[PDB]
Enzyme design. Structure first.
Site, PDB file in Angstrom:
ATOM      1  N   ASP B  32     -34.134  35.238 -48.693  1.00 13.45           N
ATOM      2  CA  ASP B  32     -33.652  34.203 -47.788  1.00 13.45           C
ATOM      3  C   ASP B  32     -33.742  34.670 -46.336  1.00 13.45           C
ATOM      4  OD1 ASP B  32     -31.635  32.368 -46.379  1.00 13.45           O
ATOM      5  OD2 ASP B  32     -31.605  31.582 -48.441  1.00 13.45           O
ATOM      6  N   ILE B  33     -34.191  33.804 -45.424  1.00 16.08           N
ATOM      7  CA  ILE B  33     -34.316  34.225 -44.024  1.00 16.08           C
ATOM      8  C   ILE B  33     -32.988  34.243 -43.271  1.00 16.08           C
ATOM      9  CG2 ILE B  33     -36.746  33.600 -43.708  1.00 16.08           C
ATOM     10  CD1 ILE B  33     -34.222  31.324 -42.145  1.00 16.08           C
ATOM     11  N   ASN B  88     -26.865  24.653 -54.847  1.00 11.10           N
ATOM     12  CA  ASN B  88     -26.285  23.633 -53.981  1.00 11.10           C
ATOM     13  C   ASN B  88     -26.905  22.266 -54.249  1.00 11.10           C
ATOM     14  OD1 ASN B  88     -24.706  25.569 -52.734  1.00 11.10           O
ATOM     15  ND2 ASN B  88     -25.979  25.705 -50.890  1.00 11.10           N
ATOM     16  N   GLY B  94     -23.767  21.277 -49.823  1.00 13.56           N
ATOM     17  CA  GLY B  94     -24.362  21.995 -48.711  1.00 13.56           C
ATOM     18  C   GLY B  94     -25.873  22.139 -48.799  1.00 13.56           C
ATOM     19  N   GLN B  95     -26.524  21.343 -49.645  1.00 12.45           N
ATOM     20  CA  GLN B  95     -27.977  21.449 -49.784  1.00 12.45           C
ATOM     21  C   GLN B  95     -28.702  21.058 -48.488  1.00 12.45           C
ATOM     22  OE1 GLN B  95     -29.607  19.380 -53.210  1.00 12.45           O
ATOM     23  NE2 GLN B  95     -31.591  20.423 -53.005  1.00 12.45           N
ATOM     24  N   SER B  96     -29.717  21.832 -48.102  1.00 11.85           N
ATOM     25  CA  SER B  96     -30.473  21.522 -46.889  1.00 11.85           C
ATOM     26  C   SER B  96     -31.969  21.396 -47.147  1.00 11.85           C
ATOM     27  CB  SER B  96     -30.231  22.578 -45.807  1.00 11.85           C
ATOM     28  OG  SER B  96     -30.656  23.861 -46.219  1.00 11.85           O
ATOM     29  N   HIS B 101     -33.269  25.091 -55.972  1.00 13.34           N
ATOM     30  CA  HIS B 101     -33.345  26.542 -55.884  1.00 13.34           C
ATOM     31  C   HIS B 101     -32.051  27.180 -56.360  1.00 13.34           C
ATOM     32  CE1 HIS B 101     -32.230  24.725 -52.017  1.00 13.34           C
ATOM     33  NE2 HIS B 101     -31.478  25.784 -51.767  1.00 13.34           N
ATOM     34  N   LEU B 102     -32.206  28.326 -57.011  1.00 13.09           N
ATOM     35  CA  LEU B 102     -31.092  29.153 -57.422  1.00 13.09           C
ATOM     36  C   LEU B 102     -30.976  30.301 -56.429  1.00 13.09           C
ATOM     37  CD1 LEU B 102     -29.046  29.751 -59.826  1.00 13.09           C
ATOM     38  CD2 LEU B 102     -30.818  31.339 -60.623  1.00 13.09           C
TER      39      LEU B 102
HETATM   40  N1  LIG Z   1     -38.753  29.675 -44.378  1.00 14.14           N
HETATM   41  C1  LIG Z   1     -37.744  30.118 -45.170  1.00 14.14           C
HETATM   42  N2  LIG Z   1     -37.830  31.267 -45.875  1.00 14.14           N
HETATM   43  C2  LIG Z   1     -36.825  31.708 -46.663  1.00 14.14           C
HETATM   44  N3  LIG Z   1     -35.661  31.059 -46.820  1.00 14.14           N
HETATM   45  C3  LIG Z   1     -35.458  29.891 -46.165  1.00 14.14           C
HETATM   46  C4  LIG Z   1     -36.499  29.345 -45.292  1.00 14.14           C
HETATM   47  N4  LIG Z   1     -36.022  28.192 -44.778  1.00 14.14           N
HETATM   48  C5  LIG Z   1     -34.780  28.007 -45.286  1.00 14.14           C
HETATM   49  N5  LIG Z   1     -34.456  29.023 -46.111  1.00 14.14           N
HETATM   50  C6  LIG Z   1     -33.201  29.193 -46.830  1.00 14.14           C
HETATM   51  O1  LIG Z   1     -33.162  28.252 -47.867  1.00 14.14           O
HETATM   52  C7  LIG Z   1     -31.780  27.983 -48.201  1.00 14.14           C
HETATM   53  C8  LIG Z   1     -31.608  26.515 -48.435  1.00 14.14           C
HETATM   54  O2  LIG Z   1     -30.577  26.308 -49.384  1.00 14.14           O
HETATM   55  P1  LIG Z   1     -29.589  25.083 -49.234  1.00 14.14           P
HETATM   56  O3  LIG Z   1     -29.169  25.149 -47.779  1.00 14.14           O
HETATM   57  O4  LIG Z   1     -28.489  25.379 -50.211  1.00 14.14           O
HETATM   58  O5  LIG Z   1     -30.496  23.925 -49.603  1.00 14.14           O
HETATM   59  C9  LIG Z   1     -30.928  28.543 -47.055  1.00 14.14           C
HETATM   60  O6  LIG Z   1     -30.211  29.697 -47.511  1.00 14.14           O
HETATM   61  C10 LIG Z   1     -31.966  28.919 -45.986  1.00 14.14           C
HETATM   62  O7  LIG Z   1     -31.635  30.025 -45.172  1.00 14.14           O
END
Ligand SMILES: Nc1ncnc2c1ncn2[C@@H]1O[C@H](COP(=O)(O)O)[C@@H](O)[C@H]1O
Lengths: 113, 115
Positions: B32-33, B88, B94-96, B101-102
């Site tokens: 995760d970034i 999420n 809190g999904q974004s 994804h797990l």
């Molecule tokens: N380019 C990326 N590379 C790796 N992780 C990412 C990237 N963009 C978003 N994320 C991560 O993806 C996750 C999204 O999960 P959620 O916010 O629960 O949908 C968050 O923890 C972000 O930091």
């Protein structure tokens, strides 16, 4: 299923508010809810923790997640929810019987603990 | 397109960079970034599924595979003291990124409640 309190619940030896059951899993409300809706989905097979789950368990573990999704919909969680699996001491695992927790009915925050 | 339109689809197709831990025909694990724990990685299906609430019954083995790959990666990364797996869903979850994804977090004591 096993030598924990979740085993006792599966065997119906102690009560729980059961949401769903089939031949291989059980869903029930958590006794210490952390959200307005907070329930568990557990396998009837005694897998002590996700770290020792075998490859052959893949379908079963996915089944916990599908049952979790369906129960969440049935319980009216249309704005979303969080699923959680805790492993070991750092994960805060409270019972050594695999369990998928589902929490909703409020905004869940970040970080997730 | 294979992998879907989100940034995770772009990661699957190697169009944007990622720090990959494991890859097979069904999934991809990468760091995760914006880590929320000393180790924080994601396991995603290569098949686009937007969120767990719309997963099909036939997706069971795939979803379980994400969990098995999650636990294997955690072991390979030395998370011997434990970890927390998180999915999420939607706004309250809190999904974004709407590609299921797990998340796997460890390397510190995780607290309760989990958000
Ligand atoms: N380019 C990326 N590379 C790796 N992780 C990412 C990237 N963009 C978003 N994320 C991560 O993806 C996750 C999204 O999960 P959620 O916010 O629960 O949908 C968050 O923890 C972000 O930091």
């Amino acid at each position: 299923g096993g030598d924990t309190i979740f085993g006792k619940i599966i065997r119906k030896e102690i009560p729980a508010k059961i949401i769903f059951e089939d031949d291989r899993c059980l869903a029930f409300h958590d006794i210490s809810p952390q959200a307005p809706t907070h329930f568990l989905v557990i396998p009837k097979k005694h897998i002590s923790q996700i770290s020792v789950a075998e490859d052959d368990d893949e379908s079963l573990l996915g089944h916990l997640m599908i049952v979790g999704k369906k129960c969440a919909a049935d319980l009216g969680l249309n704005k979303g929810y969080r699923m959680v699996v805790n492993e070991g001491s750092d994960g805060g695992q409270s019972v050594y019987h695999v369990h998928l927790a589902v929490l909703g009915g409020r905004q869940m925050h970040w970080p997730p603990g």
